[PDB]
Design a protein around this nucleic acid. Structure first.
Ligand SMILES: [Zn+2]
Length: 655
RNA sequence: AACGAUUGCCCCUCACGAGGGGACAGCUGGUAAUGGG
């Protein structure tokens, strides 16, 4: 009833080509089509319909006049056409979503503002990239995708004098139907001194020893006592490397290209969906027959055939009252693990494992284990945080170094003199003497300035207002918030375009971005695997609080300095986003159930007593003021309550 | 539970002979504007 609709990708390399990809008929022809179509306007595309059949393809190439350089493949081409229309329509769909995101942000600030009391921005100018005629600025550039199709799908590299390999693959024989041998020897302590892959005596029998040269203390974990660890093989030379490869070809009109399949073997021995002995032809049939060659990267992305592998992917994360039905259904037969995860800044995630079982009309939430992530991964988190923060500051400083002349000075000192400029203009505008009123002692709840305003008694019109749900004069904090020297937003765009471009191209940023995603998958993977090895129940369904609307899950109190009203990017909300994103992707990659329950109330109540006074929480100690108790507010009470609001779809009642 | 998996990529360690750990949904968009019931 739940058919698979997801196929994981597998990436391999490419060894040698016939001739540089630009010369390729398929590619050069596709490049011409890309150029003709990405500078085509909108309205003709509406009329345009490239037909699936080949006679319609030829009718199409004739009615517009663009040529195909001898390549009319029935249903070979269709892929190129469909993806080209896909990218073209995306470059407006992706802008339309961008504008809608800005609109939602604008609405959110308006709700905050026209309630808090300050001026409400009528609107922000609509951003579109489509020109009136239909030409598309910022057009999608030429792409390296080279789709391959069933009638061309890769096949085991037999020897053909026309097919010529680089000199390193001098003698290559490989029985395509034979079982591919295992690379490393079974016992890795046998390799002798000379042969490659020789593990020196001091990496066995894990110990701690001092190197000869300077005696620096160096430990070693030893040979890994694990059963499912990829083995790394080492050859003496690059020609010895060559003869032990997995070469497959793709043949189209006497212009081939040979690609190396070791990646798919590794990707198949990972999931244990490949027996320990398996043949090359069986491996190639284990995957879908439509790779995508990336010509600007020399990387081939295979995908899995649905039947071999590929789980179900639930389209939507489940929130709210649906949880009731999910537990009623998933628990009707068997017991389900329920790990509750709670994100923060001191302790990146805190998880509490329970074991949901079932007696008619009840969900007993037996809890097993509160835990925190281990020490080594925290050390990795710290090194990543230091690294990426340093990169961001250097990146921003750089972007600043290059700008129009009229821009640098203001953005150099906009936030520098801001506190001095702000207080001086405020005093000058309302005449207040700074020294008679203490200035440094401004806190999150201080209201000294506003009472000083009423002492001056200039008027009552400007101050009282009626926050849309009692007419209350609000915090002077709001005035402080208003009087902040934000620069022109006509140039904010120019500033952010410089920032966008520099990061878009610089390698460092991509490296760090990939590391963040990889290191964040890991932080949620360890957690999920531990809950599985702890509950002994196959179905583990992590429940995670939404952050999109999180509005009270914050630190105890901001610094009472004047400097700290404007603490841009205060070391927050990069990781958290990543954790939530990694989970929301855990939803689809492995078909897991995920539960989103609104945080805001959750972290400040408890099961022992309903009472939920907002002052009960220091920020790291959850002291109840009825049932005197001491807990780590995050680790023990917050996760327990997330599970509690999970078992029932109703959020906890308030007073 | 399911019994060490041939390149690669990342991190960590190294007596450079390698060892340990990790991601595997990828293409490109995407952390950048004024959001403490
Ligand atoms: Zn209590």
């Amino acid at each position: 009833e739940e058919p698979p609709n997801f196929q994981p990708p597998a990436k391999c390399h490419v060894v040698t080509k016939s001739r540089d990809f630009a010369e390729w008929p398929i590619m050069k022809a596709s490049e011409a089509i890309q150029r003709y179509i990405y500078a085509l306007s909108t309205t003709e595309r509406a009329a345009c319909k490239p037909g699936k059949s080949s006679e319609s393809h030829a009718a199409w190439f004739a009615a517009t006049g663009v040529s195909n350089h001898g390549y009319s493949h029935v249903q070979g081409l269709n892929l190129i056409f469909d993806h080209t229309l896909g990218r073209y329509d995306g470059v407006l769909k992706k802008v339309q979503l961008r504008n809608e995101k800005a609109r939602a942000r604008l609405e959110s600030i308006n709700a905050s503002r026209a309630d808090e009391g300050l001026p409400e921005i009528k609107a922000e100018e609509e951003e579109v990239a489509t020109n009136e005629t239909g030409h598309l600025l910022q057009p999608p550039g030429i792409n390296p995708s080279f789709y391959v199709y069933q009638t061309i799908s890769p096949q085991a590299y037999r020897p053909r004098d026309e097919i010529v390999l680089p000199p390193e693959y001098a003698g290559y024989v490989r029985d395509p139907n034979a079982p591919i041998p295992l690379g490393v020897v079974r016992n890795r302590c046998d390799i002798q001194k000379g042969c490659p892959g020789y593990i020196p005596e001091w990496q066995r029998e894990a110990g701690t020893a001092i190197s000869p040269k300077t005696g620096k203390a160096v430990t070693v974990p030893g040979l890994s006592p694990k059963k499912n660890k990829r083995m790394r093989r080492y050859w003496r030379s690059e020609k010895e490397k060559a003869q032990d490869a997995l070469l497959v070809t793709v043949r189209i009109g006497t212009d081939w290209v040979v690609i190396d399949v070791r990646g798919l073997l590794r990707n198949a021995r990972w999931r244990t969906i490949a027996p320990k002995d398996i043949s090359l032809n069986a491996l190639l049939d284990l995957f879908t027959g439509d790779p995508v060659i990336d010509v600007r990267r020399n990387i081939v992305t295979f995908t899995y055939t649905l039947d071999a592998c590929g789980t179900y992917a639930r389209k939507w994360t489940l929130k709210g009252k649906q949880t009731k039905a999910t537990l009623d259904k998933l628990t009707a037969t068997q017991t389900v693990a329920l790990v509750a995860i709670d994100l923060g800044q001191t302790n990146p995630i805190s998880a509490g494992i329970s074991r949901v079982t079932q007696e008619n009309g009840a969900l007993q939430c037996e809890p097993l284990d509160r835990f925190t992530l281990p020490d080594d991964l925290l050390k990795d988190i710290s090194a990543y945080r230091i690294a990426w923060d340093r990169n961001e500051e250097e990146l921003r400083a750089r972007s600043v170094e290059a700008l129009p002349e009229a821009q640098q000075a203001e953005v150099r000192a906009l936030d520098g003199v801001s506190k001095e400029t702000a207080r001086t203009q405020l005093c000058a505008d309302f005449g207040l003497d700074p020294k008679r009123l203490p200035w440094d002692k401004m806190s999150s709840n201080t209201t000294f300035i506003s009472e000083a305003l009423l002492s001056n008694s200039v008027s009552r019109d400007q101050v009282f207002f009626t926050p849309a749900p009692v007419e209350v004069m609000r915090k002077d904090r709001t005035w402080a918030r208003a009087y902040k020297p934000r620069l022109s937003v006509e140039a904010q765009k120019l500033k952010n375009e410089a920032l966008w471009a520099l990061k878009r191209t610089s390698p460092e940023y991509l490296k760090l971005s990939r590391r963040k995603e990889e290191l964040c998958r890991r932080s949620i993977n360890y957690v999920i695997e531990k809950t599985r090895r702890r509950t002994q129940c196959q179905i583990v369904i992590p429940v995670i609080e939404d952050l999109n609307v999180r509005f009270f899950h914050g630190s105890g109190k901001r610094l009472p300095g004047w400097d700290n009203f404007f603490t841009a990017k205060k070391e927050n909300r990069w990781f958290i986003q990543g954790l939530h994103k990694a989970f929301s992707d855990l939803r689809t990659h492995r078909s897991f159930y995920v539960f989103e329950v609104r945080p805001e109330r959750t972290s400040i109540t408890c099961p022992k007593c309903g009472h939920c006074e907002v002052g009960n929480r220091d920020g790291e100690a959850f002291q109840c003021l009825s049932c005197g108790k001491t807990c780590n507010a995050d680790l023990d009470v917050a996760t327990h309550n997330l599970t509690q609001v999970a078992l029932t779809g109703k959020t906890m009642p308030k007073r």
